[PDB]
Amino acid sequence: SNDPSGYNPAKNNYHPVEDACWKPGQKVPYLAVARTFEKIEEVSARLRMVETLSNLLRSVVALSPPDLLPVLYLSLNHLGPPQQGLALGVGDGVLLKAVAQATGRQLESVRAEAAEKGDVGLVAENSRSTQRLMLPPPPLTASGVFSKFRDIARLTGSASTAKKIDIIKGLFVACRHSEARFIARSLSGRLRLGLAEQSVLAALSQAVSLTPPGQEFPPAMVDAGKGKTAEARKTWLEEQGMILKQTFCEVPDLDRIIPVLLEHGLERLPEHCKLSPGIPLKPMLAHPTRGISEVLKRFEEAAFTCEYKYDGQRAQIHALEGGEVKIFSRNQADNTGKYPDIISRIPKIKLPSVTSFILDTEAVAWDREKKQIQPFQVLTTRKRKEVDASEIQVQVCLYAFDLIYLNGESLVREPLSRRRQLLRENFVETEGEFVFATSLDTKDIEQIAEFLEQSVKDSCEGLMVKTLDVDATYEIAKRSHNWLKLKKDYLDGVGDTLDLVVIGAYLGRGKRAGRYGGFLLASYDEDSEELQAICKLGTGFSDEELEEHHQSLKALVLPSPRPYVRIDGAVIPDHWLDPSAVWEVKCADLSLSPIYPAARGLVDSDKGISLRFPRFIRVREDKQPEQATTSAQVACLYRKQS
DNA sequence: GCTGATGCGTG
DNA sequence: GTCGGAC
DNA sequence: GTCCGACAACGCATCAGC
Numbered sequence: 192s193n194d195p196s197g198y199n200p201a202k203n204n205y206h207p208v209e210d211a212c213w214k215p216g217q218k219v220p221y222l223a224v225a226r227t228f229e230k231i232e233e234v235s236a237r238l239r240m241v242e243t244l245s246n247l248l249r250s251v252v253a254l255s256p257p258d259l260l261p262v263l264y265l266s267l268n269h270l271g272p273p274q275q276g277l278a279l280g281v282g283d284g285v286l287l288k289a290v291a292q293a294t295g296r297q298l299e300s301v302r303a304e305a306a307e308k309g310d311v312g313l314v315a316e317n318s319r320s321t322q323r324l325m326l327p328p329p330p331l332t333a334s335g336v337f338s339k340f341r342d343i344a345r346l347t348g349s350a351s352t353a354k355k356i357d358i359i360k361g362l363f364v365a366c367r368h369s370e371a372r373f374i375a376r377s378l379s380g381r382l383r384l385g386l387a388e389q390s391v392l393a394a395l396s397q398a399v400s401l402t403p404p405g406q407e408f409p410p411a412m413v414d415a416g417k418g419k420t421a422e423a424r425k426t427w428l429e430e431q432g433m434i435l436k437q438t439f440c441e442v443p444d445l446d447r448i449i450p451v452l453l454e455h456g457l458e459r460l461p462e463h464c465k466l467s468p469g470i471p472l473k474p475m476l477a478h479p480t481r482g483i484s485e486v487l488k489r490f491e492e493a494a495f496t497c498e499y500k501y502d503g504q505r506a507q508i509h510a511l512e513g514g515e516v517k518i519f520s521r522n523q524a525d526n527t528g529k530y531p532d533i534i535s536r537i538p539k540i541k542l543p544s545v546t547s548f549i550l551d552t553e554a555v556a557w558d559r560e561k562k563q564i565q566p567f568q569v570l571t572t573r574k575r576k577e578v579d580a581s582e583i584q585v586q587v588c589l590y591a592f593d594l595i596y597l598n599g600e601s602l603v604r605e606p607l608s609r610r611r612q613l614l615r616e617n618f619v620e621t622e623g624e625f626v627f628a629t630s631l632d633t634k635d636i637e638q639i640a641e642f643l644e645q646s647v648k649d650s651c652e653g654l655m656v657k658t659l660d661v662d663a664t665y666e667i668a669k670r671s672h673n674w675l676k677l678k679k680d681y682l683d684g685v686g687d688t689l690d691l692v693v694i695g696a697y698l699g700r701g702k703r704a705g706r707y708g709g710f711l712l713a714s715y716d717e718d719s720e721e722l723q724a725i726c727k728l729g730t731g732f733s734d735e736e737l738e739e740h741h742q743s744l745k746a747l748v749l750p751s752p753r754p755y756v757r758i759d760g761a762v763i764p765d766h767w768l769d770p771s772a773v774w775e776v777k778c779a780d781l782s783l784s785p786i787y788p789a790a791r792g793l794v795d796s797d798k799g800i801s802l803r804f805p806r807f808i809r810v811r812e813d814k815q816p817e818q819a820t821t822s823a824q825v826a827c828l829y830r831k832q833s
Numbered sequence: 834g835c836t837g838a839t840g841c842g843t844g
Numbered sequence: 845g846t847c848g849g850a851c
Numbered sequence: 852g853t854c855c856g857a858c859a860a861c862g863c864a865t866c867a868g869c
């Protein structure tokens with residue numbers, strides 16, 4: 192209709208044709224997307240964000256259906272389906288260089304402003320490009336921007352960075368109004384709308400339900416909910432939402448789903464897109480549980496099983512009819528080339544009656560000499576891309592815990608009791624290569640407590656807890672965190688807790704813009720009377736506690752570090768702090784660090800020690816830095832892990 | 834040919 | 845990965 | 852409970868710079 196600068200997708204009674212800012216068949220302008228992002232970021236209520244995105248999506252369906260897929264990817268800040276592994280190869284480094292060049296400003300000035308504002312988008316938006324001619328280029332389109340992001344991602348090899356920067360600069364030259372803000376945020380990986388995958392799916396199912404695709408233009412049906420009561424409309428949209436969600440969870444690939452949606456409609460979608468070996472599916476996740484009593488409350492009177500939670504990496508293993516094997520990560524990345532050793536062992540793990548399967552396993556580093564699990568850190572030293580089986584140094588043992596598909600049968604809707612029985616009967620254990628997760632079926636609190644203790648003695652993180660028959664399916668769309676995770680470090684007063692000295696602060700980004708988002712912590716090295724950086728810290732405080740930290744630390748800001756504070760390879764703090772505050776910090780584990788100097792030389796000649804999953808517990812007002820946890824005590828904690 | 838910075842990705 | 849905020 | 856985005860350590864792969 193008129194200028195996209197006035198586009199209002201949050202408008203009441205939004206009409207997909209009359210309230211759009213482009214004409215039928217025209218390319219969706221990128222400014223329409225940016226204005227939608229603005230209206231989403233302005234609100235706190237997720238369902239209001241969904242309504243606003245739905246409005247844009249309904250206009251796209253009604254007016255410009257070829258742009259639906261790029262608009263969806265822009266809204267997710269994705270480049271394509273996850274198993275294809277497209278990635279920009281752009282972070283703040285390349286982006287800030289491009290912004291500096293685009294605006295003719297010094298890199299260090301742009302970088303400082305980005306830190307201060309806590310958002311690269313605001314820096315890119317408020318500076319004019321020294322390349323822009325008098326007459327600007329034509330307005331950016333949603334599909335055009337998306338294609339340029341993909342162009343950036345496809346550039347590889349020597350001198351590819353300069354080519355990426357040229358594309359980015361070209362985008363900024365053509366930006367108008369709020370566009371540069373969101374192109375910059377997209378490139379930095381921090382769109383930070385408050386709306387992500389689940390809201391995008393809800394907006395999409397609502398949009399195609401209210402404004403059906405494939406109508407002769409002008410569409411006779413622009414709002415198919417209008418003839419329903421609010422109550423009936425709600426039930427209908429919820430049911431349509433679940434159709435899309437369950438399909439996506441089984442086939443998380445918009446390249447596959449959107450063409451079907453536009454051609455056949457949402458009600459027919461599950462006939463055309465179904466779970467199948469070779470296509471990765473969304474894995475079941477776990478909800479953290481802070482005690483066995485919380486477990487029993489959550490699973491009330493539902494029989495459940497406890498399993499060791501192995502400390503490795505998830506491997507979703509697919510065997511297709513015909514013999515091909517694929518392996519995917521928890522995030523649906525294709526890891527087949529990383530595990531030639533697993534591929535060769537598949538004939539050894541499955542009985543010959545098994546013709547196809549999808550297995551849910553943990554890959555764990557395994558010492559064949561000592562016949563014992565090795566730490567996560569050892570597993571991460573595996574090579575990633577096209578490994579050959581002869582060159583493997585770190586062997587892996589698979590710990591299998593679920594079966595999602597068998598001999599052409601999807602088990603998504605089957606109870607774990609049956610899925611587990613099919614797993615145990617149709618696959619073959621080999622010690623140190625493929626074994627079923629150690630498990631316990633019980634409701635006795637004391638057996639569970641002992642099992643949790645035993646899992647930690649047996650090199651695991653704690654327990655997974657899973658119902659066997661009540662709400663015990665693998666339907667991620669119904670509940671994505673259907674399993675519980677119980678770790679010792681969740682229990683109040685249990686686990687590795689340290690008192691550490693605050694030696695630096697980092698300016699916050701995004702939700703933390705305008706205050707500190709993170710802090711640099713140190714342990715006390717008695718031998719050298721130095722404070723040694725041990726880790727950064729960025730979670731565990733409430734918003735109120737974070738404002739209190741900002742107040743209590745402001746007087747401690749130094750221009751230059753104290754001579755007895757050693758940070759070696761740590762990120763230099765934005766504000767150095769006079770060592771004074773002592774905070775209680777909890778972690779899951781201690782790790783040998785390539786950068787942190789804490790306790791260097793006490794366990795390893797070259798490496799100090801850091802904290803895995805550190806979080807703030809409380810301030811120790813009754814401790815001064817000389818009573819903080821010592822670097823010797825840190826070393827003792829690390830050795831005790833064995 | 835090598836190294837450190839950068840990016841992606843796992844947890 | 846942990847965590848807290850908004851719903 | 853769900854969803855989201857602040858923030859953690861640290862591995863391999865890649866590429867600019869040398």
Ligand SMILES: *P(=O)(O)OC[C@H]1O[C@@H](n2cnc3c(N)ncnc32)[C@H](O)[C@@H]1O
Nearest residue numbers: 477498499500501504505553592628655
């Ligand atoms: P997040 O804290 O959601 O943890 C889930 C991951 O735990 C791993 N895992 C190890 N052992 C198990 C068992 N027995 N069952 C399920 N998941 C397990 C997986 O890698 C998960 O992704």
